[PDB]
Design an enzyme around this catalytic site. Structure first.
Site, mmCIF file in Angstrom:
data_model
loop_
_atom_site.group_PDB
_atom_site.id
_atom_site.type_symbol
_atom_site.label_atom_id
_atom_site.label_comp_id
_atom_site.label_asym_id
_atom_site.label_seq_id
_atom_site.Cartn_x
_atom_site.Cartn_y
_atom_site.Cartn_z
ATOM 1 N N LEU A 188 42.368 39.815 77.867
ATOM 2 C CA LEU A 188 42.423 40.845 78.897
ATOM 3 C C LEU A 188 42.814 42.181 78.298
ATOM 4 O O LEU A 188 43.376 42.243 77.179
ATOM 5 C CB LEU A 188 43.441 40.443 79.976
ATOM 6 C CG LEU A 188 43.080 39.211 80.799
ATOM 7 C CD1 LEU A 188 44.200 38.808 81.749
ATOM 8 C CD2 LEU A 188 41.772 39.435 81.553
ATOM 9 N N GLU A 200 58.307 49.003 38.053
ATOM 10 C CA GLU A 200 57.261 50.012 37.921
ATOM 11 C C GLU A 200 56.082 49.403 37.209
ATOM 12 O O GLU A 200 56.220 48.403 36.487
ATOM 13 C CB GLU A 200 57.794 51.238 37.140
ATOM 14 C CG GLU A 200 56.844 52.410 37.023
ATOM 15 C CD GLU A 200 56.281 52.960 38.341
ATOM 16 O OE1 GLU A 200 55.743 52.204 39.203
ATOM 17 O OE2 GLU A 200 56.227 54.220 38.447
ATOM 18 N N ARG A 238 46.492 43.655 75.865
ATOM 19 C CA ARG A 238 47.106 42.468 75.246
ATOM 20 C C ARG A 238 47.278 42.650 73.706
ATOM 21 O O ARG A 238 47.404 41.669 72.977
ATOM 22 C CB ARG A 238 46.249 41.237 75.532
ATOM 23 C CG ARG A 238 46.691 40.453 76.774
ATOM 24 C CD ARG A 238 46.714 41.322 78.058
ATOM 25 N NE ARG A 238 47.082 40.491 79.202
ATOM 26 C CZ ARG A 238 47.292 40.933 80.444
ATOM 27 N NH1 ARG A 238 47.046 42.179 80.771
ATOM 28 N NH2 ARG A 238 47.678 40.077 81.364
ATOM 29 N N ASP A 277 36.188 44.287 68.218
ATOM 30 C CA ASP A 277 37.331 44.530 69.071
ATOM 31 C C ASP A 277 36.838 44.833 70.493
ATOM 32 O O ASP A 277 36.379 45.946 70.750
ATOM 33 C CB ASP A 277 38.111 45.756 68.520
ATOM 34 C CG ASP A 277 39.318 46.104 69.346
ATOM 35 O OD1 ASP A 277 39.689 45.308 70.224
ATOM 36 O OD2 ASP A 277 39.858 47.210 69.187
ATOM 37 N N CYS A 308 48.985 37.025 77.257
ATOM 38 C CA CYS A 308 50.311 37.462 77.721
ATOM 39 C C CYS A 308 50.326 37.771 79.214
ATOM 40 O O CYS A 308 49.502 38.568 79.690
ATOM 41 C CB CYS A 308 50.725 38.718 76.994
ATOM 42 S SG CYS A 308 52.412 39.232 77.425
ATOM 43 N N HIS A 320 64.371 55.458 42.635
ATOM 44 C CA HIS A 320 65.598 55.623 41.902
ATOM 45 C C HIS A 320 65.909 57.108 41.791
ATOM 46 O O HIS A 320 65.006 57.903 41.587
ATOM 47 C CB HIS A 320 65.459 55.075 40.476
ATOM 48 C CG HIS A 320 64.259 55.558 39.754
ATOM 49 N ND1 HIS A 320 64.260 56.707 38.992
ATOM 50 C CD2 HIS A 320 62.990 55.101 39.732
ATOM 51 C CE1 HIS A 320 63.043 56.948 38.545
ATOM 52 N NE2 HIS A 320 62.243 56.011 39.016
#
Ligand SMILES: CN(C)c1cccc(-c2cc(Nc3cnccc3S(C)(=O)=O)cc3nccnc23)c1
Ligand SMILES: O=P(O)(O)OC[C@H]1O[C@](O)(CO)[C@@H](O)[C@@H]1O
Length: 433
Positions: A29, A309, A32, A111, A141, A240
């Site tokens: 829905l 590093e 969500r 989507d 949900c 640092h």
């Protein structure tokens, strides 16, 4: 049975003398978190090197049709709007095809609501005929507080609601959602969807049902979803304090903080204390300069080798001038392809990302965290959070004695720079030509 030559940039031995792409289908829905997930997942996938792109059907609809006026557009009895919506889906799928088959894409995130079996069946059919895998992610949900929060945070500010105030945008959106409720058929992995590959996420990551994972990209997506959360928090990234190599313009090594670096460390402690955070975790590398910086904080910290590093191989401990004089071709190759270049017997930024992946996963699980690290490592992390490309990553600006404060907002991350007013050398080197 072929003879070998070592490639100039990546240092890869190659012989010399002359996995189906996946469509990720979002389901659920409106409001969500489908778009939120599509975007965040795509940021992760691209950062780990899996070319991914979101195809949001809503954006196709917004381009095809004049300014939005109301939820009537989403009425199921709206014959014309239903046709337009269907053609927008088909157009987005044409682009998915083109991306995955022709443009190097590996993952396409489709989507949309995709709330009907019929729509999903059509996507399945499209995938099988292009030889793409299909993987479904459904978000479920029924908590009105969550839905309302989503609407206020990312819906009412969208271009659809430009000519509406908040109350009325919210009213409209609630009616809009109701338009999808009667025909919503949830994924049914027991029975009708038993054969699909899917994850159904319930109540904002509280519970998962996972069915038939088909390949390693899919299990990793699942692992990622099981580690992210939407609780508010803050991430601070810094380097640092200035160190003795920095004063000499020397790369790599394991030198200690200079006098200014130590002033930065005290300044960082003051900054952290003024942020007044709960349960701030502190991470460092295993290199002295980050650990001395953390020592000023009087907070517990944990060291990670993965935050060390970038390893400059035979160029460790040298100035960029010594590298240019001693290894002129290596210096030039790195300026030409700074992300993929490997130092001899050392690393590239690409390598960095692989070893920082567990750092990112743990960062996703945590809440407030301060990471004290190094230039190239900090760029890699920042690229992840800010969705910067591999080509951009090695040139992101992360000065000494400056805290980058990251806060989740809407579909992304706000970044705030806070310089703690302690001088240092500048170790930033621009892209040249
Ligand atoms: C955690 N995990 C694993 C997971 C998985 C799938 C969905 C979601 C999710 C994410 C979400 N985020 C989101 C959406 N729009 C605006 C803001 C945000 S937020 C909370 O990121 O600031 C809202 C949701 N609503 C309902 C169901 N699920 C939602 C989460
Ligand atoms: O990728 P770049 O720009 O050389 O930056 C990485 C370098 O920065 C430093 O952290 C500081 O100079 C070096 O130790 C390291 O080699």
């Amino acid at each position: 049975p072929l003879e070998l030559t070592q490639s100039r940039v990546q240092k890869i031995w190659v012989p010399v003398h002359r996995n189906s792409p996946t469509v990720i289908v979002m389901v659920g829905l409106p409001a969500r978190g489908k778009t939120y997930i599509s975007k965040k997942l795509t940021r992760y996938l691209n950062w780990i090197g899996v070319p991914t792109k979101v195809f949001n059907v809503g954006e196709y609809r917004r381009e095809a049709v004049k300014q939005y006026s109301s939820y009537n557009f989403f009425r199921p009895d709206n014959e014309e709007a239903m046709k337009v919506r269907k053609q927008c889906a088909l157009a987005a799928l044409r682009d998915v095809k083109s991306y995955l088959a022709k443009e190097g894409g590996q993952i396409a995130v489709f989507d949309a609501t995709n709330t009907t079996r019929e729509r999903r069946h059509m996507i399945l059919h499209f995938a099988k005929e292009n030889d793409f895998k299909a993987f479904f992610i459904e978000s479920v949900c029924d908590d009105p507080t969550v839905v309302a929060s989503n609407i206020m945070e990312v819906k009412i500010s969208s271009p659809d609601y430009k000519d509406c105030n908040s109350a009325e945008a919210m009213d409209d959106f609630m009616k809009r959602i109701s338009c999808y409720e009667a025909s919503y058929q949830p994924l049914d992995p027991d029975k009708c969807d038993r054969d699909l590959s899917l994850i159904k996420v319930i109540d904002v990551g509280r519970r998962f049902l996972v069915n038939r994972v088909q390949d390693h990209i899919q299990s990793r997506i699942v692992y990622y979803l099981m580690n992210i959360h939407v609780q508010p928090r803050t991430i601070y990234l810094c380097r640092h304090g200035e160190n003795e190599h920095n004063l000499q313009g020397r790369i790599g090594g394991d030198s200690g903080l200079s006098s200014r670096g130590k002033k930065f460390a005290s300044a960082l402690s003051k900054f952290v204390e003024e942020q007044n955070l709960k349960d701030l975790r502190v991470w460092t590398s295993q290199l002295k300069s980050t650990i001395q910086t953390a020592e000023a904080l009087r907070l517990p910290y944990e060291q990670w080798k993965a935050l060390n590093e970038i390893d400059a191989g035979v160029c460790e401990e040298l100035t960029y001038e010594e590298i240019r004089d001693t290894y002129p071709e290596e210096y030039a190759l790195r300026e030409q392809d700074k992300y993929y270049y490997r130092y001899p017997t050392g690393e590239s930024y690409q390598d960095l990302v692989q070893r920082l992946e567990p750092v990112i996963m743990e960062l996703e699980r945590q809440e407030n965290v301060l990471v004290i690290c190094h230039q190239a490592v900090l760029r890699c992390l920042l690229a992840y959070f800010l969705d910067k490309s591999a080509e951009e990553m090695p040139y992101l600006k992360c000065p000494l004695h400056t805290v980058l404060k990251l806060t989740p907002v809407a579909y992304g991350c706000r970044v705030e720079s806070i310089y703690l007013n302690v001088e240092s050398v500048c170790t930033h080197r621009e892209r040249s030509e």
